[PDB]
Amino acid sequence: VHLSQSGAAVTKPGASVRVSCEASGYKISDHFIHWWRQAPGQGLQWVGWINPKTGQPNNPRQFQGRVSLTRQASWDFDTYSFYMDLKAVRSDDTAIYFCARQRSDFWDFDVWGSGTQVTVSSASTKGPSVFPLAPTAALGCLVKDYFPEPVTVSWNSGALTSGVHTFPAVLQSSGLYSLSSVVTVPSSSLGTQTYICNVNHKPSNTKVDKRV
Amino acid sequence: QMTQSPSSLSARVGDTVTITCQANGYLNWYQQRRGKAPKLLIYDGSKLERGVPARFSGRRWGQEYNLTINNLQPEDVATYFCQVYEFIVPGTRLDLKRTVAAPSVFIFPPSDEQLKSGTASVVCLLNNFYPREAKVQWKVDNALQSGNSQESVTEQDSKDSTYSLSSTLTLSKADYEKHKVYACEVTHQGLSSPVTKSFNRGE
Ligand SMILES: *[C@@H]1O[C@H](CO)[C@@H](O)[C@H](O)[C@H]1NC(C)=O
């Protein structure tokens, strides 16, 4: 009994975004599918349910608003795709969206999708720009002004892992992200060792490799 | 009308922790790992979900629902929450307790490569401290900056059970050069006295 969700989505404010949930592995017709959403550092909020048998969502048109829940039956009935359409998006909508299965009539949710990030930002693709953090002492790299998430940071092409902290990216009023990656090492070994953070940003085939 | 207590728990491996909600109805408890989807631990007050260690259990008495974890393990580090129909409490962070540890503190002046871009970024690093509550203060020439700061913190470290925190003071090219002393002053439990690491032009 399993639920797989679509990949991360990015969209400009005022547009529409679709999140998909593929269900398989049981009598799918027999269980409601709920959608939940989780804003950064926050608790879950109910978004709605849909009945797989009839396609009936919890709010009827007159109440649905900016969200519309749909299904399409993979006619064998071994598979079903469930959709969450969000129209006229805004920053508020930025969050992880989960589909989940209602087991009993009483809303115990025993299976969850892995979740889908929906990032609504004014901006669009940009590779990051990397500046060094120069000095047991500490050294690092500031990975600044990229979009969208994510980036991967390694040191000495993966040969250095100990003492490495790669922090969560924060967001700026710029509307773009900045994160920093750091290592600590004994006050010696400096002049001895070549410290090189390799940064990657898939979305933009950016792939700098900077030294400290 | 549903509440949960408390908002944060630290416990030692092998210890027992209890988390309470106030609520009404068919209630379920979930575990959620920092970065992941919830996992059902108990349904309907006290029924243990198939496949979950019996060191989890739940007690209803009136409007009080306890979730109890006995013999706490390293994989129990997560957020826990209760849920009744559409309503899900914000939940309790549980972390593993360890000996108190003051932050290794450092500062990082703007890179000149970057000043070439017009934006300057000063960085502060608090490294490997516990417990996780902390306060950074950005001071320059004893001026107290009160906007213009980001903060980011790591998850509890799966090895040494510490946290780390990075704080980025971003300010324009001009207003940077005009001042001299840049200090980072942080206050943490494990530190007898707020301590500062402070630079300026001497390099
Ligand atoms: C919950 O635990 C608290 C503290 O352990 C205790 O006083 C109370 O008996 C428990 N509540 C229930 C409903 O078992």
Side-chain angles (χ1 to χ4, degrees):
Chain A
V1 40
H2 184 254
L3 300 174
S4 82
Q5 308 193 227
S6 53
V10 159
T11 178
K12 338 280 264 94
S16 286
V17 54
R18 161 166 288 196
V19 174
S20 321
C21 180
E22 184 81 338
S24 70
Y26 70 95
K27 193 89 187 300
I28 293 178
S29 333
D30 282 7
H31 300 277
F32 287 83
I33 287 298
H34 293 240
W35 293 87
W36 300 84
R37 117 230 194 100
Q38 191 175 41
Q42 235 133 172
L44 299 162
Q45 289 180 4
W46 187 62
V47 172
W49 54 250
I50 181 160
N51 175 342
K53 251 176 286 231
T54 69
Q56 182 197 348
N58 65 293
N59 286 322
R61 290 293 302 187
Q62 66 243 20
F63 275 104
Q64 53 149 32
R66 276 170 38 243
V67 176
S68 103
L69 313 184
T70 42
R71 52 136 198 189
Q72 195 66 32
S74 179
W75 78 267
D76 16 51
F77 294 100
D78 67 335
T79 275
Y80 272 93
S81 318
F82 301 97
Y83 302 115
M84 204 230 66
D85 292 325
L86 247 182
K87 77 183 175 186
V89 287
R90 346 141 137 186
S91 64
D92 265 354
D93 307 327
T94 296
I96 295 189
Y97 290 87
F98 298 103
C99 64
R101 182 189 82 131
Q102 178 188 332
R103 180 163 61 195
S104 83
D105 293 325
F106 312 95
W107 290 48
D108 53 326
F109 291 102
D110 72 329
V111 185
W112 297 71
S114 59
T116 303
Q117 183 60 251
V118 168
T119 294
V120 177
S121 82
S122 236
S124 38
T125 325
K126 179 190 163 163
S129 120
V130 196
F131 311 103
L133 273 336
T136 269
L139 67 88
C141 278
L142 173 78
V143 178
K144 187 166 199 317
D145 287 320
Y146 65 107
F147 190 123
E149 291 260 35
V151 268
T152 80
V153 167
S154 113
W155 292 84
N156 304 348
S157 188
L160 179 54
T161 49
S162 271
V164 170
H165 291 293
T166 288
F167 294 81
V170 311
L171 178 60
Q172 325 179 263
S173 68
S174 131
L176 308 178
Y177 296 116
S178 151
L179 83 70
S180 57
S181 179
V182 312
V183 218
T184 59
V185 305
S187 280
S188 85
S189 131
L190 267 358
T192 287
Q193 194 59 250
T194 174
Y195 291 137
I196 192 179
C197 75
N198 350 119
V199 177
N200 191 320
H201 187 257
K202 248 248 175 188
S204 66
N205 201 341
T206 321
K207 51 182 187 241
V208 22
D209 202 347
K210 199 102 179 322
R211 188 174 42 85
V212 186
Chain B
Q1 68 184 356
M2 62 189 92
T3 32
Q4 198 180 306
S5 124
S7 48
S8 282
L9 276 206
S10 288
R12 228 93 203 201
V13 166
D15 212 346
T16 284
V17 304
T18 287
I19 310 188
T20 304
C21 295
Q22 300 310 330
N24 216 71
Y26 193 96
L27 172 142
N28 311 306
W29 288 99
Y30 308 76
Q31 179 195 69
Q32 173 180 44
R33 260 147 208 154
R34 0 229 81 168
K36 304 287 189 164
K39 163 164 194 160
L40 185 50
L41 305 168
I42 315 284
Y43 64 95
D44 189 21
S46 48
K47 277 67 176 298
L48 168 58
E49 162 81 350
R50 172 80 196 145
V52 174
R55 72 202 166 71
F56 295 83
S57 59
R59 258 288 226 78
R60 176 183 180 163
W61 178 261
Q63 58 170 73
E64 238 204 11
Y65 298 71
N66 286 355
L67 166 74
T68 289
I69 314 171
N70 183 60
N71 191 13
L72 182 84
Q73 298 300 311
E75 341 128 17
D76 295 340
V77 167
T79 292
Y80 296 87
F81 48 82
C82 62
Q83 168 251 348
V84 177
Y85 289 105
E86 299 160 33
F87 190 159
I88 288 200
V89 169
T92 301
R93 286 177 175 158
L94 182 55
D95 79 8
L96 234 53
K97 211 161 190 221
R98 71 181 292 311
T99 303
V100 169
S104 235
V105 204
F106 322 113
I107 201 147
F108 282 103
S111 80
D112 295 33
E113 178 180 340
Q114 188 201 10
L115 291 78
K116 288 189 193 176
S117 80
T119 318
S121 306
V122 192
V123 177
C124 202
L125 167 52
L126 288 50
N127 215 41
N128 304 37
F129 53 96
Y130 188 95
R132 62 150 311 163
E133 306 73 15
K135 262 215 46 51
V136 85
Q137 285 192 328
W138 274 116
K139 269 173 195 163
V140 32
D141 291 333
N142 298 92
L144 233 173
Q145 279 58 32
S146 308
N148 85 15
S149 241
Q150 302 306 54
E151 263 194 0
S152 211
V153 176
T154 39
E155 287 311 287
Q156 183 169 60
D157 189 287
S158 76
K159 295 229 46 80
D160 64 33
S161 285
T162 66
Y163 293 87
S164 283
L165 172 154
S166 163
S167 181
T168 322
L169 172 78
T170 41
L171 71 74
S172 101
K173 62 176 181 134
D175 18 84
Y176 163 60
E177 310 252 276
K178 293 179 179 179
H179 327 238
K180 172 71 174 321
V181 38
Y182 294 82
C184 191
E185 184 194 87
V186 287
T187 86
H188 174 37
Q189 162 140 329
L191 222 11
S192 49
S193 51
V195 94
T196 300
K197 290 284 192 135
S198 22
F199 76 103
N200 66 349
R201 273 311 140 270
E203 76 269 44

